Amino acid sequence: YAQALQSVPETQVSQLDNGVRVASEQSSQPTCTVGVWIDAGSRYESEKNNGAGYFLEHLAFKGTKNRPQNALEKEVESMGAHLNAYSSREHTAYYIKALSKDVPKAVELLADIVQNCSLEDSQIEKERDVIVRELQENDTSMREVVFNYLHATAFQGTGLAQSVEGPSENIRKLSRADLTEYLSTHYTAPRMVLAAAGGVEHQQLLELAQKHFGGVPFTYDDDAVPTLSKCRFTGSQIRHREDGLPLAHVAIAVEGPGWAHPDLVALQVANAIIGHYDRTYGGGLHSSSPLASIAVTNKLCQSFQTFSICYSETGLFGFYFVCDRMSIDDMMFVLQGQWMRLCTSISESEVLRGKNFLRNALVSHLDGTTPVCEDIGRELLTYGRRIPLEEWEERLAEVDARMVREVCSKYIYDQCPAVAGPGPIEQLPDYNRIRSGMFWLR
């Protein structure tokens, strides 16, 4: 095992005279996946700019000036390659998966997109109504509105509070211009990363990129990367009620440290302890995760998930459960009790497993090419370089009990949480109560 890790090939990295960082992991696999990952999200938008990046995503594929829609689509389909992508609050990306016999072709396709989207005044107007619709579909997914609302209130009044898709007004009116304005402002080499994994050999990649990414920086701005305005967390709640729904959704959380910070490992290990449930499990005997056990014994919920979603300089460490109108309270009671237990009286027997369960994730985090690429893409972009499983190992292979406590309690104990809840939530006690559910009557 340790050897298996030790024998895992290093991930080549190198920046251009441009600013783009080109990294990759050579394997053998006849297939592979390459793509660019941008240092851009909704976080970077304005009150009037917000949604661009997304409006933009829906056009990124519909063709370039160098080769219109009918073609781009035809050329990719024709080579059996897959082009897909996404955009969060601080992180966007476009990736392709082909037979590593096409690094050069893929690489070119990529560039041609992150640099020359047609932005056909005629296509735009179409996607405009496609989103407004797609948006009204994202809506009934109470599992997502809830998180949005969480962020909303959690980081109320700041860039983070804005949802990645954006208001209908913005989408109804963004101009062919604004989109261009968003592209030419954030899609710059210094903030972008060209990553890959497969049978591809670094050099052929570099050159190929160094060839199609012919960007040139004049001034110093171009060459530099602007740091964002800090986001203020706020212990608060938001309740979107409607007994009209089948069941309720709840999400509570404290502020997170941020990528850079190490503790995100100990903290990542703690969540592995409370883990997650889901009525399709087979386990009233689930190892620890009493929250799950209890959830089963007393029928506390349909499911729940522990999460340490983080950003550049902040984040959200919390949990979210889906439950029936009548078991909302106990569930919250029992869970919120686990955080305390977590940081007030944890045990080695627990952390031991915690670790293992993580390591197994940590590894399956890299199952395939597309996913690996995702790490290189991210890692660089958010951490600075790449963290080898061999490393993550140690980092989280030396977390003892006392370590979990010290930290969890450092981030959870007597902190003013941020809760959000849509659906039939009459039974969810007031803030004050969930608040004083943040300190154990030790």
Binding site: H240, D430, Y431, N432
Partner: protein, 48 residues
């Protein structure tokens, strides 16, 4: 008629100072817990 007198008053003093100090504290405390409501904000959003 009331030998207490002096004792009863020195006592009255001490009580007055406690009321003085105790009520404002619990007042601030009462005000503190409540704020979550006094400040609260409703909104009605029918999907129309």
């Amino acid at each position: 008629a009331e030998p207490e007198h002096d004792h009863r008053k020195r006592m009255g003093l001490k009580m007055l100072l406690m009321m003085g100090l105790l009520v404002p504290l619990v007042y601030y405390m009462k005000r503190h817990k409540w704020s979550v409501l006094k400040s609260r904000k409703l909104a009605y959003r029918p999907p129309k």
